[PDB]
């Protein structure tokens, strides 16, 4: 079934979309630990704008709290709360 | 408030996820990016990576614009990841 233009266009326009982000991007200095899962689902701006002089960037951000397991190789593991950046709103803005 | 471990674990695991992929002087395509299923997320250990195991094509209408001269709807075929697995890296 061919996806009709109207649906392709609405679905791909600049907005916050679920993105699977590795935890080391947000917690880079944690080489002594293994996190599980090692990545988390976050809303991040994605998609395209109508003009090539515009770019899809966040205009409202906040953090989201998730339960993560943090493993110390050979020395057990704990469940804890970690906090990650998410994009609440996104807009097409001039590249400048 | 807080996403629970079971849910973070299940939702983050290697699977096909909707990804907005750019299609690529005379023409502009609109939209310039399309929504496609692409393998993503993570696996149980750092020795494993999430890869596509079943793929297929999907046809979408895309507008081709010659600015201030014309604009046509055309069909384009894109690649989809239907299934993904965690497999040893190398």
């Amino acid at each position: 079934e061919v996806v009709k233009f109207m649906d392709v266009y609405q679905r791909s326009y600049c907005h916050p979309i679920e993105t699977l982000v590795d935890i080391f991007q947000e917690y880079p200095d944690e080489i002594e630990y293994i996190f599980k899962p090692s990545c988390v689902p976050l809303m991040r701006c994605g998609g395209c704008c109508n003009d090539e002089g515009l770019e899809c960037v966040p205009t409202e951000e906040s953090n989201i709290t998730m339960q993560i397991m943090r493993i110390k190789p050979h020395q057990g593991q704990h469940i804890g709360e970690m906090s990650f950046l998410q994009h609440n709103k996104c807009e097409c803005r001039p590249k400048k | 408030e807080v996403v629970k471990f079971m849910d973070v674990y299940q939702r983050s695991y290697c699977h096909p996820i909707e990804t907005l992929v750019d299609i690529f002087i005379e023409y502009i395509f609109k939209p310039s990016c399309v929504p496609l299923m692409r393998c993503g997320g993570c696996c149980n250990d750092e020795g494993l990576e999430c890869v596509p195991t079943e793929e297929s094509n999907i046809t979408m209408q895309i507008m081709r614009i010659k600015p201030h001269q014309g604009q046509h709807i055309g069909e384009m075929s894109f690649l989809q990841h239907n299934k993904c697995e965690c497999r040893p890296k190398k």
């Binding site: 947000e26 599980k36 943090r70 704990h78 804890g80 709360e81 970690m82 | 471990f5 079971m6």
Partner: peptide, 20 residues
């Protein structure tokens, strides 16, 4: 950023129970 402990856990991410 930041860590807020919830519990020591097993390999499945379920909290351990106290022995006593």
């Amino acid at each position: 950023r930041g860590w807020v402990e919830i519990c020591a856990a097993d390999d499945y991410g379920r909290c351990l129970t106290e022995a006593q």
